[PDB]
């Protein structure tokens, strides 16, 4: 039951990080050229380029 | 509410391993 509930907590973060940070509703309009989005980066170590 | 990244990522980057390692080091070295 512990490994089974990791799987549903894993699959829920696929739904939540797409609903909140991805472009699913913008991907419906043209799936052949709109390029999907998994999640967003918050990396402090990034430079501006 | 994209400001939650500024408060969850440093906690999981810094606070979560510091709280975990300081628990486990005192637990494995415990007579």
């Amino acid at each position: 039951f512990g490994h089974l509930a990791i799987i549903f907590l894993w699959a829920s973060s696929l739904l939540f990080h797409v609903a909140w940070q991805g472009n699913f509703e913008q991907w419906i309009k043209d799936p052949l050229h709109v390029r999907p989005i998994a999640h967003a980066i918050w990396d402090p170590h990034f430079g501006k380029p | 509410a994209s400001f939650l990244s500024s408060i969850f990522v440093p906690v999981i980057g810094w606070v979560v391993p510091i709280a975990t390692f300081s628990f486990l080091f005192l637990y494995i070295e415990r007579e």
Binding site: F1, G2, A5, L9, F16, A19, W20, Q21 | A1, L4
Partner: peptide
Amino acid sequence: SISDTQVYIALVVALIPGLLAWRLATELYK
């Protein structure tokens, strides 16, 4: 995207498996 309100509902609901995972992982012994 989803509204700013709905993110906080997802965080509070996520404490319910977060509490139950702490109960299961300590019922399985130390």
